[PDB]
Design a protein around this ligand. Structure first.
Ligand SMILES: [Zn+2]
Length: 61
């Protein structure tokens, strides 16, 4: 049957993502981008990503 399966890597650099429980987002450290999770579904699309604020880069170090 047709199902939804998607690899969880940054749509740009293909690197791993960090799960942020509080903002329900998947973050790419190397690109400083946060992808949204909508209806429990990670939106792995460059168009959906938001750039991180510098106040946010602080917690990833
Ligand atoms: Zn990336």
């Amino acid at each position: 049957d047709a199902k939804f399966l998607e690899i969880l890597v940054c749509p740009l650099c293909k690197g791993p993502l960090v799960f942020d429980k509080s903002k329900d987002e998947l973050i790419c450290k190397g690109d400083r981008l946060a992808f949204p999770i909508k209806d429990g579904i990670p939106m792995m699309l460059e168009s959906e990503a938001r750039e991180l604020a510098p106040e946010e880069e602080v917690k990833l170090e």
